[PDB]
Each structure stands twice: as structure tokens, then as C-alpha cells.
Design a protein around this ligand. Structure first.
Ligand SMILES: CC(C)N1[C@@H](O)C(NCCCCc2cccc(S(N)(=O)=O)n2)=C(c2ccccc2)S1(=O)=O
Length: 236
């Protein structure tokens, strides 16, 4: 059984995620509209980069609500968020993938297909893994609690670059891993391999993070510049 502390924490991560989602779709009409070459492709790219900026702000606001994140130094708080942002973005992207339409819905009604992603200015080398991962995630069928716990485990990764106190980070990850392991045993007691399969997704997210780095490097060669916010997180 889950302890009262485990239950309240799980519910709090779920509540923190619903709140980020609610205040984001509320602040949706303040995004460059989605519209033939030149100017329209520039506008399409500006639209797509603005959605990423909203997600970075959302992730930062969620992290602050994650118990234990405020125990870390400002230094390590940045180091963890810097590396986790895209991995969290991809997890959330997989969560808004529709099997019937083969489309990802950002915010409230912004719906995108594989073609729409290529129109925004992304490589097939990066689009295919997104949808490949989105379909792979659909097969697990994670609830709001399992998604929230996975993000918390992803945030508190001690092996991230520039982490001054990895011991502190590893100690903070432990209660979340314990919570997900307990939740899994309660939810589906028949499927013992549900928990390792969720952790195998963290393995996949690291490869996807490298693919995303290759996508950013490709944009520099394509003379497409990133906004000041996204440049701070995703550049050499
Ligand atoms: C050109 C570079 C800088 N890129 C982009 O401009 C971008 N824009 C879309 C941002 C997704 C916003 C998003 C994610 C997840 C959840 C919610 S939300 N607001 O609906 O909760 N929004 C990327 C992206 C695409 C798919 C998955 C992850 C990243 S990119 O890094 O290739």
C-alpha cells in the first residue's frame, strides 16, 4: 500500500502538472499565428519556437513545485533543468499524440502532423524518432501519476553535466523511484515488467536528446537562429 506521505506527494505532482497545463492554454492567443515559400516559413518557425519557450517556462514552474528541488543550490537547479527540459518536452509531446489522427496537439487546439513538423523547419532525422517514441509511449498507457513521477525521476538525474552535488541529487531521486515502484505494484500487480519498461524510456530519452542536439546544430548551418531563451539552454 502507498503511505499517506507517498499519496499526498503523488497528488501534488499531478496537481502541479494540471495547473501548468491550465495557465498555458489560457495564455494561448498571445502566440504568432500559423499561416508558398519565404516569410510564411519564417512565421511558422517563429510560431514553433514560441511554443518551446512556453514549455521551458512551464517546466521551470513545475520544477519549483516538485518537493526537494528547492533544497538544491541555484547552480545545480539550472544544471538539472538545462538537461531535463527536452526530455520532459518529449514525454509531454508523447502524451499529446493522437493514434486516430497521427497528430500531436500542443496547448488547446494547435494540432500537428508529421508534415506540419517538417513545414516548421525540422529534419526527418528528428521527426521520425518523435512519432516513433510517441507510439512506443502509447503502448505502456501511463496515467497522470506515472507521467508525473517519471518527470520527477528525470529531473533528479545525478549524472547530468555541471552537477556540483550529485549525492544530494541521487538522494532526492530515491523517494520518487520508491513511489513509482510502489504505485506500479498496486496498479498492475500482474505485470512485474511495467516499472523497468518505464525506466527503459529514460534510456531512449537520452538518445532523443542527442538527436535534438543534432537538430539544433543543423539549424546553425541552415542560418536559422534560436530565440535568446532557447539559445541559453540548447547551444555550444
Ligand atoms: C527548432 C527547435 C528549437 N524546436 C522547437 O521549436 C520545438 N517546438 C515545439 C515545442 C513543443 C511545445 C510543447 C511540448 C510539450 C508540451 C507542450 S504543452 N504547452 O502543450 O504542454 N508544448 C521543438 C519540439 C518539438 C516536438 C517535441 C519537443 C520539442 S524543437 O526543440 O525541435
Amino acid at each position: 500500500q502507498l503511505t499517506a506521505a507517498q499519496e499526498l506527494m503523488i497528488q501534488q505532482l499531478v496537481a502541479a502538472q494540471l495547473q501548468c497545463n491550465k495557465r498555458s492554454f489560457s495564455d494561448q492567443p498571445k502566440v504568432t499565428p500559423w499561416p508558398q515559400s519565404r516569410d510564411a516559413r519564417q512565421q511558422r518557425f517563429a510560431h514553433f519556437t514560441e511554443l518551446a519557450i512556453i514549455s521551458v517556462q512551464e517546466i521551470v514552474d513545475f520544477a519549483k513545485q516538485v518537493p526537494g528541488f528547492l533544497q538544491l543550490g541555484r547552480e545545480d537547479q539550472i544544471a538539472l533543468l538545462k538537461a531535463s527540459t527536452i526530455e520532459i518536452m518529449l514525454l509531454e509531446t508523447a502524451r499529446r499524440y493522437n493514434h486516430e489522427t497521427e497528430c500531436i496537439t500542443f496547448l488547446k487546439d494547435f494540432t500537428y502532423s508529421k508534415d506540419d513538423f517538417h513545414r516548421a523547419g525540422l529534419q526527418v532525422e528528428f521527426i521520425n524518432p518523435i512519432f516513433e517514441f510517441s507510439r512506443a509511449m502509447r503502448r505502456l498507457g501511463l496515467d497522470d501519476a506515472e507521467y508525473a513521477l517519471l518527470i520527477a525521476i528525470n529531473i533528479f538525474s545525478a549524472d547530468r553535466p555541471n552537477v556540483q552535488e550529485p549525492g544530494r541529487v541521487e538522494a532526492l531521486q530515491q523517494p520518487y523511484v520508491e513511489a513509482l515502484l510502489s504505485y506500479t505494484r498496486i496498479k498492475r500487480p500482474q505485470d512485474q515488467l511495467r516499472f523497468p519498461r518505464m525506466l527503459m524510456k529514460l534510456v531512449s530519452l537520452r538518445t532523443l536528446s542527442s538527436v535534438h542536439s543534432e537538430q539544433v546544430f543543423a539549424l546553425r548551418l541552415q542560418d536559422k537562429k534560436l530565440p535568446p531563451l532557447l539559445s541559453e539552454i540548447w547551444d555550444v
